[PDB]
Amino acid sequence: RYNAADIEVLSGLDPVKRRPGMYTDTARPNHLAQEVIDNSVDEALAGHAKQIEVTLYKDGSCEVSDDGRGMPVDIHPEEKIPGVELILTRLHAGGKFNNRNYTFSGGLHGVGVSVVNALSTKVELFIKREGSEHRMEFRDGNAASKLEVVGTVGKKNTGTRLRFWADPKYFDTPKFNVRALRHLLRAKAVLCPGLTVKLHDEATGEQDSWYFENGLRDYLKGEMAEHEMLPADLFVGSLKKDTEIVDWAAGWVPEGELVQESYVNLIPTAQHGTHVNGLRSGLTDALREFCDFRNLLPRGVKLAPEDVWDRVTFVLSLKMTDPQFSGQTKERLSSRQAAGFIEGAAHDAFSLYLNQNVEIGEKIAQIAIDRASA
Amino acid sequence: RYNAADIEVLSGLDPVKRRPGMYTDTARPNHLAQEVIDNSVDEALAGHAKQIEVTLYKDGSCEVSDDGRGMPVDIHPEEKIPGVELILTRLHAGGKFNNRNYTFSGGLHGVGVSVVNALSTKVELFIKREGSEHRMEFRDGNAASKLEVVGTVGKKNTGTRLRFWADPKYFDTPKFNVRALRHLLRAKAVLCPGLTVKLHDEATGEQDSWYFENGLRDYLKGEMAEHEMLPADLFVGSLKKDTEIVDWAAGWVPEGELVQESYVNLIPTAQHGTHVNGLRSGLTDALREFCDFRNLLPRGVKLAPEDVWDRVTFVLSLKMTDPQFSGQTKERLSSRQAAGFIEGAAHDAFSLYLNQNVEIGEKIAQIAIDRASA
Numbered sequence: 073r074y075n076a077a078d079i080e081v082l083s084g085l086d087p088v089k090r091r092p093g094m095y096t097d098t099a100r101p102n103h104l105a106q107e108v109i110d111n112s113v114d115e116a117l118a119g120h121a122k123q124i125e126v127t128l129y130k131d132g133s134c135e136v137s138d139d140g141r142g143m144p145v146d147i148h149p150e151e152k153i154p155g156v157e158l159i160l161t162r163l164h165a166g167g168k169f170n171n172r173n174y175t176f177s178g179g180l181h182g183v184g185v186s187v188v189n190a191l192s193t194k195v196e197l198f199i200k201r202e203g204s205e206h207r208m209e210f211r212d213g214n215a216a217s218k219l220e221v222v223g224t225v226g227k228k229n230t231g232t233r234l235r236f237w238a239d240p241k242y243f244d245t246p247k248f249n250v251r252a253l254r255h256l257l258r259a260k261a262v263l264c265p266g267l268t269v270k271l272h273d274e275a276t277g278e279q280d281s282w283y284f285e286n287g288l289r290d291y292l293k294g295e296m297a298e299h300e301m302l303p304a305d306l307f308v309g310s311l312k313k314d315t316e317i318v319d320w321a322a323g324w325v326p327e328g329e330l331v332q333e334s335y336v337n338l339i340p341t342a343q344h345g346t347h348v349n350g351l352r353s354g355l356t357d358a359l360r361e362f363c364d365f366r367n368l369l370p371r372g373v374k375l376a377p378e379d380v381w382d383r384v385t386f387v388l389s390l391k392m393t394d395p396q397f398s399g400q401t402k403e404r405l406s407s408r409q410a411a412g413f414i415e416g417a418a419h420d421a422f423s424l425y426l427n428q429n430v431e432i433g434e435k436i437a438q439i440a441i442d443r444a445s446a
Numbered sequence: 447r448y449n450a451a452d453i454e455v456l457s458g459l460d461p462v463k464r465r466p467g468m469y470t471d472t473a474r475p476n477h478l479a480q481e482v483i484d485n486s487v488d489e490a491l492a493g494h495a496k497q498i499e500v501t502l503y504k505d506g507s508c509e510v511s512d513d514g515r516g517m518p519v520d521i522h523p524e525e526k527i528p529g530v531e532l533i534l535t536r537l538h539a540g541g542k543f544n545n546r547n548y549t550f551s552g553g554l555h556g557v558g559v560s561v562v563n564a565l566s567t568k569v570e571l572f573i574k575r576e577g578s579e580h581r582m583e584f585r586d587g588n589a590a591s592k593l594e595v596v597g598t599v600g601k602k603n604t605g606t607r608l609r610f611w612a613d614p615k616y617f618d619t620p621k622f623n624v625r626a627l628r629h630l631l632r633a634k635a636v637l638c639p640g641l642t643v644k645l646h647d648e649a650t651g652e653q654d655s656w657y658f659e660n661g662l663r664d665y666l667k668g669e670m671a672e673h674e675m676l677p678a679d680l681f682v683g684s685l686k687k688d689t690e691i692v693d694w695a696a697g698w699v700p701e702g703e704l705v706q707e708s709y710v711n712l713i714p715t716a717q718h719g720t721h722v723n724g725l726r727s728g729l730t731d732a733l734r735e736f737c738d739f740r741n742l743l744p745r746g747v748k749l750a751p752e753d754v755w756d757r758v759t760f761v762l763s764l765k766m767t768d769p770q771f772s773g774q775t776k777e778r779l780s781s782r783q784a785a786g787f788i789e790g791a792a793h794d795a796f797s798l799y800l801n802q803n804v805e806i807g808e809k810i811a812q813i814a815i816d817r818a819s820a
């Protein structure tokens with residue numbers, strides 16, 4: 073029949089092994105690498121790392137090296153294991169449930185690295201802290217070694233280096249999408265100024281290396297260099313509040329295909345969420361108030377946000393303490409705070425731009441008016 | 447600094463309370479009710495329940511009652527607490543990790559009910575099993591009462607009744623979307639024939655009761671009675687293989703707005719996924735093997751899936767052992783197996799309909815090819 077005994081409890085990393093679809097993208101191990109990139113970028117965003125180096129080995133493994141603080145090797149006071157063993161083997165264990173150890177961290181669930189380990193036949197990592205370099209190895213998510221000291225290092229030579237071999241049984245294909253991972257990694261250098269990011273595909277000999285201090289405008293200009301945007305130089309804005317920061321570059325294109333990237337604590341949000349909603353409302357408000365204060369609007373036509381957005385190319389990078397994502401892969405942002413904050417920020421900053429740059433704003437407005445009439 | 451002590455381990459329901467966005471749609475508590483609905487529908491899908499009754503009380507709470515097997519009240523052999531206590535209190539604990547207690551269940555993660563309670567100021571449930579009626583109450587996710595024997599019942603009166611009071615701090619709005627929950631509940635009666643589904647919103651004066659012995663074709667006809675489809679009588683198909691079942695009704699609409707509903711073990715998948723991709727592939731493949739065999743397709747123009755799919759209206763219901771969803775909200779199905787299974791079923795079944803009903807099959811092709819003209 074049906075009793076309490078028929079209720080089974082998955083513990084440790086087993087929930088990830090039995091249903092990985094809810095913890096990662098099972099199409100490719102790219103998002104597993106992303107999880108490791110993110111923890112390195114989070115160290116970078118906290119002013120502790122200045123270099124992320126990603127290597128795609130010919131044996132299918134991927135490795136991420138940062139010069140951040142290194143994940144703790146110390147013994148957990150109420151968990152009996154060294155921190156790294158705890159981090160790699162337990163769900164909902166992480167340093168980012170507060171805003172003490174990381175301010176604007178991409179990681180929030182304490183699940184990321186553990187998913188990598190749970191879905192990797194092998195994980196080998198080297199941590200450098202307190203003058204000593206350590207090594208720990210895992211197999212099929214289980215601890216495969218002890219906390220080894222492999223060498224001595226300079227006191228301030230710190231960092232985490234993690235290399236994982238994705239188990240092909242959990243994925244439609246074990247092959248990495250290099251173009252996507254290349255694009256992803258460069259944007260991390262654009263969005264975290266001062267961070268040097270390198271990628272090395274040992275299968276093709278590719279090397280790439282990025283460093284940008286103030287490059288959001290030039291980043292989006294470069295991604296649509298073939299197309300004619302207006303303003304030709306890409307309206308950019310910003311707003312800081314030490315709990316929320318927003319940066320964006322936006323343009324309107326009469327012809328061609330649209331770059332539309334959005335980010336939350338440097339994590340890409342493919343289905344965009346609420347922060348993109350605020351940018352649309354704010355830009356729309358500033359544009360329907362510019363069409364009316366100047367009577368650019370034929371009569372009978374009213375601008376819907378859809379008309380504003382149909383031909384926009386934007387790059388939105390929001391940073392906030394405690395975002396709210398809909399899943400571990402973090403594809404849309406559902407924080408309701410974000411919609412208003414960006415709408416206001418963009419509404420003020422675009423209104424000033426238009427009343428300062430009247431002829432350009434008209435040419436913007438005509439693109440929206442042409443979409444609404446249609 | 448930053449040592450192992452700074453790594454926090456959230457246990458119990460604490461992960462849900464600190465980051466509810468990854469476990470539910472925090473825009474409104476609708477998805478909390480869905481989790482309770484889903485567990486009742488799974489009892490129905492296992493041939494043990496024949497009526498689910500949903501009541502949206504004016505005090506903001508929701509209650510879902512089924513006449514199924516009732517969730518276990520005995521003590522778990524290795525967890526020491528009664529089954530209901532384990533179900534409500536622990537993550538990744540369920541009877542749906544195998545195909546023993548439920549064959550085609552919507553639930554797969556063992557997390558659903560725990561999320562509802564974890565995000566509710568109060569939860570009160572009644573179970574009917576073993577001739578005795580039990581009751582247990584929760585507050586803020588914690589057990590607030592014991593497993594009380596509140597009454598006696600007949601041997602064959604069995605069932606589960608759960609009432610939860612969603613904590614308003616976790617949600618953008620505490621009011622339920624009745625239109626959405628109304629539409630949802632009707633699909634459960636349509637997709638599980640013989641199941642009687644009742645909705646009672648005590649605030650809207652609304653009462654509803656759904657029962658269909660065969661309603662898939664009639665369901666889509668009613669939702670697109672406002673537009674003229676082709677075939678006017680709605681091409682439908684089906685296929686069973688003792689591991690997966692697929693049912694669908696599909697039509698092509700020259701004018702009006704397209705209803706496109708997809709389901710996996712009766713759980714709605716709004717961002718459809720692989721089951722819809724296979725249906726699109728099968729129907730498109732079958733239509734060119736018809737446009738080319740009957741030479742209705744101009745050459746130099748080719749039929750792509752987008753052209754077939756541009757104006758399709760479908761309702762697709764897949765049932766399979768071990769689906770794979772991308773998140774707790776189960777918005778996309780990523781099982782790549784399902785894509786092929788439906789493609790074959792749809793490809794064979796659509797080829798037959800066209801070759802028998804060609805004057806209709808032609809007018810279908812005209813919609814697809816004209817759409818390709820652009």
Ligand SMILES: Nc1ncnc2c1ncn2[C@@H]1O[C@H](COP(=O)(O)OP(=O)(O)NP(=O)(O)O)[C@@H](O)[C@H]1O
Pocket residue numbers: 107110111112115138140141142143144159165166167168173178179180181182183184185186187232453
């Ligand atoms: N490169 C690193 N350097 C230092 N600490 C790290 C590093 N990578 C991971 N950590 C620690 O590992 C813990 C858990 O990481 P992880 O499993 O990725 O979950 P999370 O990053 O905290 N949040 P999420 O990724 O959304 O599940 C964090 O609390 C960090 O303190």
Ligand SMILES: Nc1ncnc2c1ncn2[C@@H]1O[C@H](COP(=O)(O)OP(=O)(O)NP(=O)(O)O)[C@@H](O)[C@H]1O
Pocket residue numbers: 079481484485486489512514515516517518533539540541542552553554555556557558559560606
């Ligand atoms: N109405 C019910 N009748 C009988 N058993 C139930 C009922 N509701 C819940 N259960 C049991 O409680 C377990 C946990 O349910 P739940 O937390 O909703 O997750 P799940 O159904 O296992 N899968 P998921 O919904 O994706 O998390 C189920 O596996 C059932 O065994």
Ligand SMILES: [Mg+2]
Pocket residue numbers: 107110111178179180184185
């Ligand atoms: Mg992380």
Ligand SMILES: [Mg+2]
Pocket residue numbers: 481484485552553554558559
């Ligand atoms: Mg469930």
